[PDB]
Symmetry: C2
Subunit: 300 residues, 2 copies
């Protein structure tokens, strides 16, 4: 009947998951107790949405939130200037961490943001969200401010009563196989999450689209379920990404899970083919992004 | 840009992949050279489609095809009667291997069929296909009969000019990580494939929905990429929950073949009523059936 995974997951849901994370901004400010909060929006060519995300967070500046930074990854559209006008601080990868040459991918941006921020709590929110809700940051920081022993909070979106394909086909099944207690986390790949500086400075950062799952597993391997919480951010329909983006995402999720769980990885990516009447000429990507070491090895 | 594995991928697609098989039934019959062909359709509650599949293969019986069997896995609908009416012999799991109690899942059915068939070549075709093409069996056996050194033929379906979600997000990326040459196989999880008796009797069979990936990986390791071919068969909507459970078993079987320590924990959904909570957990098995030549050694030796 019941397994040890079932028992732990059920109890974790009752203690470390909030379906209605309704703490008030005032009570969260009162609980800061000298701690400061930084909010980071990673961004690459998100000109249509970045300002709207910033606008939903900026009312918290000077109270709950101490800094609001857009960490730009080399946009060629109007991402940076729209973020400026909307009321954020825009910092490039190069200014965030001058002593290390950048490499591509989302994980690099989040890692570098640790060097550019000062908060005791760092909140990450994706910059591609349409009409996000102003209560995202309060909900994400609640367990960090109020619940002893929590270092990582994952924000999830409620599923309607009536596409998450990488989460449900790749990430959750692989966690079931390799780290089954972590199947408790509803949206392990979600981009809205918060952590303590103590935690985040102490773990390596996986590259590209592996960053979220890498942080989740590294936290678990150091502190177990007790240190991880999740909060319901409300409704939000699934994003529709191209299938080729998704297969590449899956491949990086696999690589990052394997690196943390002791499984070797070939470094071989997926193959694209030149196709014509003479057949299919393969071109296969190979690994070129490295994990970044804990930021404590360079700062603080 | 080109990388190290691309040479092997290019050679294999040139020699072992057929986008447009030219073969006629007549040429294939003339090439059998004393080999016999068994066709096996695994089935569990497929009354709406099984007859249609059988009807497309039945005209080959007595010529290209020597035996046509539906291996029924305990259906309670009209699968059995509809398969017989279309011209298949229907064999239960118990009849196929009477002294061994059945275990659930698709892999069990295919494994058991090895004890109930006599072919030097065995062709598997899913019984849930809609409007299958009568050239499926000819296309699948072509490389076995007309090429040298091929032991496993995987049928693939035509890709569009732009749901295979498990293949493209799970199987192919995992193979890239753990058996990188095998990403060249377009349909690693496909249910339409043919193998030699020599191969099939000698390998363990993975349980459940792991059977196809397990056979592919075992064939690759033991016989190599050149022993695997693929053929275009020409042109389904399952709930995400079912695809996730299938993915979880594909993972378990690949991990078993690599020695990765899979927990055996399935995918769990909690349900609640007035009395409380209880989990519903998807089926996962890490236990292979042993090579059929260990239980049917005399049959295997007769066929060798
Ligand atoms: O509060 C929601 C909840 C859901 C499933 C559980 O097992 C426990 C709690
Ligand atoms: O009775 C159901 C229940 C769900 C979640 C909780 O946290 C507590 C109770
Ligand atoms: O903020 C999202 C992001 C995505 C891809 C990148 O390379 C960098 C940032
Ligand atoms: O401190 C709790 C803890 C739990 C599980 C681990 O593996 C390590 C630490
Ligand atoms: O496709 C055939 C099949 C047989 C037994 C199963 O359990 C599942 C599928
Ligand atoms: O035969 C090779 C091939 C590769 C990719 C496709 O999408 C189709 C065919
Ligand atoms: O995909 C999730 C799942 C959970 C329980 C099951 O029984 C089957 C599937």
């Amino acid at each position: 009947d019941l397994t040890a995974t079932d028992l732990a997951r059920h109890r974790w849901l009752t203690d470390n998951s909030w379906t209605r994370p309704t703490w008030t901004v005032a009570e969260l400010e009162a609980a800061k107790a000298g701690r400061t909060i930084s909010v980071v929006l990673p961004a690459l060519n998100e000109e249509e949405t970045v300002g709207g995300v910033v606008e939903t967070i900026r009312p918290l500046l000077g109270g709950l939130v101490d800094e609001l930074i857009v960490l730009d990854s080399g946009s060629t559209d109007d991402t940076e200037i729209r973020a400026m006008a909307a009321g954020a601080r825009v910092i490039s990868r190069e200014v965030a961490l001058p002593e290390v040459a950048p490499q591509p991918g989302k994980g690099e941006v989040l890692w570098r943001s640790l060097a550019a921020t000062t908060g005791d709590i760092i909140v990450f929110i994706d910059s591609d969200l349409i009409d996000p809700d102003p209560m995202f940051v309060p909900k994400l920081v609640g367990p960090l401010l109020l619940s002893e022993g929590v270092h990582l909070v994952k924000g999830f979106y409620r599923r309607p009563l009536k596409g998450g394909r990488v989460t449900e086909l790749v990430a959750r099944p692989l966690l079931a196989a390799l780290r089954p207690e972590l199947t408790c986390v509803l949206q392990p790949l979600g981009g809205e999450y918060a952590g303590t500086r103590e935690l985040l400075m102490s773990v390596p950062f996986a590259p590209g689209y592996g960053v979220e799952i890498g942080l989740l597993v590294d936290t678990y391997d150091r502190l177990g379920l007790d240190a991880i919480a999740q909060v319901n951010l409300g409704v939000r329909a699934h994003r529709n990404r191209p299938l080729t983006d998704l297969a590449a995402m899956s491949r990086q999720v696999i690589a990052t899970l394997f690196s943390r769980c002791g499984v070797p990885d070939s470094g071989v990516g997926l193959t694209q083919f030149f196709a014509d009447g003479d057949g299919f000429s393969p071109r296969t990507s190979e690994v070129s992004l490295v994990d970044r070491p804990p930021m404590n090895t360079l700062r603080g």
